[PDB]
Specification:
It is a single chain. With about 100 residues, the protein is α+β, with helices and mostly antiparallel strands. The chain has one domain (about 1-95): SH2 domain (SHC Adaptor Protein). About 20% of the residues lie in helices and about 20% in strands. The protein has helices at about 10-20, 70-80; strands at about 25-30, 40-45, 45-55. Strands 1-2-3 form a three-stranded antiparallel beta sheet, with helices on one face. Its main location: nucleus.
Length: about 100
């Protein structure tokens, strides 16, 4: 399951992830018109929830609190740690 999709629409990201069989199924998309402005599109339960990945300076990526140097480091941290702080919900690969 290949997670990175360079720059595709918000409606096309919601259509592909709602069809997927896996709980936690995600893709990281770039926002349409804004360069270097990312969004983690991740299915939590049944709804595809778009958490904004902001950039601090050079090569840095922060959505939750602490910054993550690469987009692969942002994925592998929240694959075991929770994004939504109540029930534990993690990042799983697409079909």
């Amino acid at each position: 399951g290949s997670w990175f999709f360079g720059k595709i629409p918000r409606a096309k990201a919601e259509e592909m992830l709602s069809k997927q069989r896996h709980d936690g199924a995600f893709l990281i998309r770039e926002s349409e018109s804004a360069p270097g402005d990312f969004s983690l599109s991740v299915k939590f339960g049944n709804d595809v929830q778009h958490f904004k990945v902001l950039r601090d300076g050079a090569g840095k990526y922060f959505l939750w609190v602490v910054k993550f140097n690469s987009l692969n480091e942002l994925v592998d941290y929240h694959r075991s740690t929770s994004v939504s702080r109540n029930q534990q919900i993690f990042l799983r690969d697409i079909e």
